[PDB]
Amino acid sequence: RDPDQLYSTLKSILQQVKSHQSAWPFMEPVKRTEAPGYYEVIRFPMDLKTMSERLKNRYYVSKKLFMADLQRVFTNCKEYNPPESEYYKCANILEKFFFSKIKEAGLID
Ligand SMILES: COc1cccc2onc(N)c12
């Protein structure tokens, strides 16, 4: 069940990330109205709702595709927001959590 092993593992990892107390800024797409100039600077927006959909839609056929999207959630945030903002802080906390979980799961060697 090599496809469903991957799916299972990713779903677990994604749920844990979504349940984390620092995930709240990333739960839905950034709104243009709340972020002036966001979509002019961030070319590939990503969020955890979209990732959930992608997962359900069987898009994440490799660990690399999953990693790229979730990494993008953090890097987008860090480019856009000031370094001591609450959003920037949440990104790094959640990113630390993400790297531990992917290492825990044996997704990167
Ligand atoms: C509440 O989410 C936001 C609102 C406005 C700007 C944002 O940048 N990164 C975010 N996660 C974000």
Domains of the chain: 1-109 (1.20.920.10)
**Rounded to the nearest whole angstrom, what is the distance from the C-alpha of residue 93 to the centroid of ligand 1?**
15
- Helices 63-80 and 86-104 cross at an angle (nearest 10°) of 160
* CA–CA dist 34, 18 (Å, integer): 21
**Rounded to the nearest whole angstrom, what is the distance from the C-alpha of residue 22 to the centroid of ligand 1?**
13
* CA–CA dist 13, 2 (Å, integer): 17
DSSP H helix total and E strand total for the chain: 5, 0
Elucidated via: X-ray
Ligand 1 pocket residues where CB is under 6 Å: 25-26, 30, 34-35, 77, 80-81, 87
Tokens 């609450």 sit at which residue? 86
Residue with the smallest CA separation from ligand 1 atom 2 is 25
The CA distances from residue 25 to 3, 4, 21, 41, 104, in Å, are: 30, 29, 10, 18, 24
- DSSP of 29-77: PPPTTTSTTHHHH-SS---HHHHHHHHHTT---SHHHHHHHHHHHHHHH
